Subunit: 114 residues, 4 copies
């Protein structure tokens, strides 16, 4: 199934944060309404925060995460969880290799903010 | 129900990262084996990262998050999610006031690393 | 935090299913727009499906689960999880006693149907 | 990413329940020890329970769900959620066609029981 695609409420601020756990340099692109709105790159095997930013979901609410290593797309896994009917997390893992730890870039989207 | 308590695999490194969304300064304590292992603090209404660290779950694997604001413990909400049977998120929201957004301190624990 | 309350799409069918795991007879109430729409009951320590029903979420979409045992409300835990941005589960556990297994009545709400 | 595969605690009883929402007849296989341990089959567009059972996760704890329609394997989506560090849900959706509702067979695994 499609992964890394989330529908947020329109015109809503959200956080996006990326972590790296791989020998390869991760590139994370975050698209809002099919246009890149944030980009983070870096290498870590210690869960470095390679980027964290506040974005706006815009009129469409369409948010997509893409992960690649030197242009090669990683395979994605994702889900969303809502706590107390109010607090939202959109979660992404990605795999750049063969071990299927799916932590090579980890992306967390959270809303609402403020 | 108890919230903010998670059983990780023993002796396993994990990431812990906290975000703030409130007027009030958030103090986040992370306990491993019922001892404080990390403390983060800061203030933001824009989802700033107020701390991030790698810890070890230790022999018992017991990890607990607590949050205090303006002299009182915040009410917590939490869950754990596992993607593709490999990638683990332990998620915490917290409420320091009356609006029940539960985002006042948000804490993300993720494992495995590396 | 409040538990067992979910905002579903308005006017939409959903499934609700309850499982029992306790020496005590469970009573599960499902409220749509604050009025009882289904009630299930039974006594099992082996996950009996004491009820399953298709309901409509009505004009407001508000769905609430409550659980009682020997006329006493059980403590609830809950969350919602969304797979591939389309498939929704609202999950409830409940505790009638002292062991904190939270499985005494388990309720799963799923949508969309058809 | 692989879907429908879950690691349960070893030698632990768990519930498995399947629902149908499709014109096609669903066949749900549940594997423990990498061998089929239960099979459910039925057809409904109204979320009917097509089977429920209690199984033992065996020495490895590995549980797998597979779904087909008239011999054609359905595409799966899955995740595991843990509430209050105690109550586990392993959730599966499946798609047999083109609409990507992923509800054509829905499978809920829950543990612990009792
Ligand atoms: C150090 C290794 O780097 C890449 O091979 C990753 O795919 C592995 O998961 C591991 O992080
Ligand atoms: C700015 C406000 O600060 C505190 O009152 C928080 O509890 C509110 O959620 C909001 O973030
Ligand atoms: C048999 C026991 O019955 C009640 O005490 C439940 O609260 C326990 O969880 C257990 O199911
Ligand atoms: C009635 C329809 O039957 C199959 O085409 C399913 O894939 C659809 O989701 C729908 O349930
Ligand atoms: Ca990897
Ligand atoms: Ca890795
Ligand atoms: Ca608040
Ligand atoms: Ca807030
Ligand atoms: Ca109990
Ligand atoms: Ca019980
Ligand atoms: Ca379908
Ligand atoms: Ca369907």
């Amino acid at each position: 199934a499609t992964q890394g695609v989330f529908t947020l409420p329109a015109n809503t601020r959200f956080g996006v944060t990326a972590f790296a756990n791989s020998s390869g340099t991760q590139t994370v692109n975050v698209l809002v309404n099919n246009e890149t709105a944030a980009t983070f790159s870096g290498q870590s095997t210690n869960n470095a925060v390679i980027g964290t930013q506040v974005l706006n979901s815009g009129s469409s609410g369409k948010v997509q995460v893409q992960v690649s290593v030197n242009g090669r797309p990683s395979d994605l896994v994702s889900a969303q969880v809502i706590l107390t009917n109010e607090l939202n997390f959109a979660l992404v893992g990605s795999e750049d290799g063969t071990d299927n730890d799916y932590n090579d870039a980890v992306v967390v989207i959270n809303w609402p903010l403020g």
